[PDB]
Amino acid sequence: STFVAKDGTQIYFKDWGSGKPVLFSHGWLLDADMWEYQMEYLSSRGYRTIAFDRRGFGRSDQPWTGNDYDTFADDIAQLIEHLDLKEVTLVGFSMGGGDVARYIARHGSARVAGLVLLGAVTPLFGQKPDYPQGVPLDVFARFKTELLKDRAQFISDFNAPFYGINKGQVVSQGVQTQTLQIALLASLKATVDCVTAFAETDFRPDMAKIDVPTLVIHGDGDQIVPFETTGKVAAELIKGAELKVYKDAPHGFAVTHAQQLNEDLLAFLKR
């Protein structure tokens, strides 16, 4: 399905099943397909599942402008309004934890029942003057330099640390190929601008606006988004939040720990 955002951008989404809605926001490089197994799992158990391709990714249009978290959050607001969703459980992976958090911060929680943050960049990813424990901006400047030379090989090399294959996680060649295929659909411009967005955007003000039941899940083997300065902190900053830590799990744990995640999502929903 599609809708058209404020600035004319057509955004692809899937809307499966019936019942209480669960809206998924994917990570960097990926698209709505990264959620296919969670969507099938929950929609065959009485939930409605909705997942969109972020602007510049997957099957959506690729605008030059608006590749920033305020726009991403308003794109989510527009999808929610397009479908007239109510009592939504928002679920964000990696950089997509930021746009579901920013949506609550900008739009409030009247339509929201709950929030799930998976390996998310919340509450802050890159260093700031009062956050020297964050990831040095040097690191993200280098992502951008490498992407602007050869984004295809960058994505391919990123599979190993993303999935923890260099630390004994087992992921098939097929999954690695699908990840690269999906990533290559995206815009080079959006891909690079997202680096700016997740490197530098501070969601700590957002944490204080989250007034719904919240579950944070994160792998403590995560080589991309360090658990100790993101998920661990987000769980403390959000009032009432629950934390689950998947032992030695990588960033790409919706694949390596799919069954565990499916069961944890269902239990959160049934709380």
UniProtKB/Swiss-Prot annotation:
Catalytic activity, EC: 3.1.1.2, 1.-.-.-
Pfam family, one: Abhydrolase_1
Subunit note: Dimer of trimers.
GO MF, one annotated term: arylesterase activity
Species in which this protein is naturally found: Pseudomonas fluorescens
InterPro entries reported for this sequence: AB_hydrolase, AB_hydrolase_1, AB_hydrolase_fold, Epox_hydrolase-like
Role noted for this protein: Hydrolyzes phenolic esters, such as phenyl acetate, nitrophenyl acetate and naphtyl acetate. Can act on a wide range of esters, but reaction rate and enantioselectivity differ significantly depending on the substrate. Shows a preference for esters with small acyl groups. Also shows low perhydrolase activity, and catalyzes the reversible formation of peroxycarboxylic acids from carboxylic acids and hydrogen peroxide. In vitro, enzyme-generated peracetic acid oxidizes bromide ion to bromonium, which reacts with monochlorodimedone to form bromochlorodimedone.
UniProt keyword terms in alphabetical order: Hydrolase, Oxidoreductase, Peroxidase
Domain (AB hydrolase-1): residue spans on this chain: 20-252
Protein's UniProt name: Arylesterase
Misc. comment: It is unlikely that perhydrolysis is the natural function of perhydrolases. Instead, perhydrolysis is probably an accidental (promiscuous) activity. Perhydrolysis is an important reaction that makes peroxycarboxylic acids, which are useful oxidants in organic chemistry, for lignin removal and pulp bleaching and for disinfecting wastewater and disinfecting equipment for food and medical applications. Perhydrolases were previously known as metal-free haloperoxidases.
pH effect on activity, per entry: Optimum pH is above 9.0 for esterase activity.
Catalytic residue positions: S94, D222, H251
Thermal dependence summary for this entry: Optimum temperature is 70 degrees Celsius for esterase activity.
Keyword flag Acyltransferase: no
Coiled-coil residue windows: none
Residues bound to acetate: W28, M95
Catalytic activity: a phenyl acetate + H2O = a phenol + acetate + H(+); peracetic acid + H2O = acetate + H2O2 + H(+); a percarboxylic acid + H2O = a carboxylate + H2O2 + H(+)
Domain of life: Bacteria
UniProt family annotation: Belongs to the AB hydrolase superfamily. Bacterial non-heme haloperoxidase / perhydrolase family.
Gene that this sequence comes from: estF
